[PDB]
Point group: D2
Chain length 122, copies 4
């Protein structure tokens, strides 16, 4: 539901996610991280299922943030993959991959994996 996803959300680390869900399945917005080599807001883009199943199944979605803005550049990018569950306590449960640019010899250790849960603010 675009109106379900659209809004301001926060995760367990204190980071902010502001997103707008479009009728064509597009997601656009900004992300502010509470941790890492990051400062201020960064641009995010993604996609979601705009015609989900009418049962109690979640809405699949995903988005990306490249950690470069006009103030800092960490030479890394993160992608979040998960689903939106709406209702009184709507949540977006995700798993993420954070890849840093490295030399070919240090590539084996270029990707971190984790999970974040977002709660929507009214």
């Amino acid at each position: 539901a675009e109106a379900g996803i659209t809004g301001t959300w926060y995760n367990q680390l204190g980071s902010t996610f502001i997103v707008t869900a479009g009728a064509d399945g597009a997601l656009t917005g900004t992300y502010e991280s509470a941790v890492g080599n990051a400062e201020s807001r960064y641009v995010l883009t993604g996609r979601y299922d705009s015609a989900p199943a009418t049962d109690g199944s979640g809405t699949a979605l995903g988005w990306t943030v490249a950690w470069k803005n006009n103030y800092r550049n960490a030479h890394s990018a993160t992608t979040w993959s998960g689903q939106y569950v709406g209702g009184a306590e709507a949540r977006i449960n995700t798993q993420w991959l954070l890849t840093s640019g490295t030399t070919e010899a240090n590539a084996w250790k270029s990707t971190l994996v984790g999970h974040d849960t977002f709660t929507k603010v009214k």
Copy 2:
């Protein structure tokens, strides 16, 4: 480095990725998978580092595809995270996460993980 990402890429499964990289960090294009509950092309959007390091490091990037188009709807989405390495034989090395919409009872088995390598051949 830079521009080199724009083009048509293919992975080991035979899927096709057509992308345009914008000067300020955006990635836009279409994806066609050779496997799965998919048929024809789907829209993709992502981001990449438009000012990478000057030592011999790769260019970090990522993108997403929601598997719904005029033909089918698989009620799932995949995100690829990796880095671009240019040179005589450029490649994009990635790891991906594919999440399907499920009921809460099946949420523990909603996400698949894999890796894909793309080249221009």
Copy 3:
């Protein structure tokens, strides 16, 4: 601390983990899952850091379960990777990979990824 890890633990899905930590860094025990194509107990084996850092860092560890016992065989195996944090509320936080045996053509979809948090029972 072998005495810290050794014990009975439960995760958020209602599954049971019984383990013994050895002086040489070995982990042995049984696992009972609340979900999936599984029934009864399964054998588990793993390793942990038996000489961790003396600061507030966790103790790294990991273990594996192949889902075959004398009653059922699901032709799959799971590995849990994480760390032990002790104190009053001791927890083992993990991320896991579940791989199923498949034909080469369906290999791209052979592995699931998730996370489990275990609480120790007294």
Copy 4:
């Protein structure tokens, strides 16, 4: 199928894996990594499906290495999960998770993920 797992295997990085597969599902041996905060050999233990399916499916397995031995202690552990495929050129295809001990404040960046392919060459 079966016995074929016992032996010496090498991955793309040049690391060496020496394992013994027991009739009832156990895996035991040593590992030597070519990269990282490691030197010499380390002990490994795991499990595999000792009765796989009869169609053309692979054999599921997994194993763990805590990176402490008489020489160094990196305060980390890695687990590999994958499947064994036998034939003229057998391989073990895996995805791994490497967790380092951290303070709670750094727990968000404690785990690395990757993939390794092992062959007997």
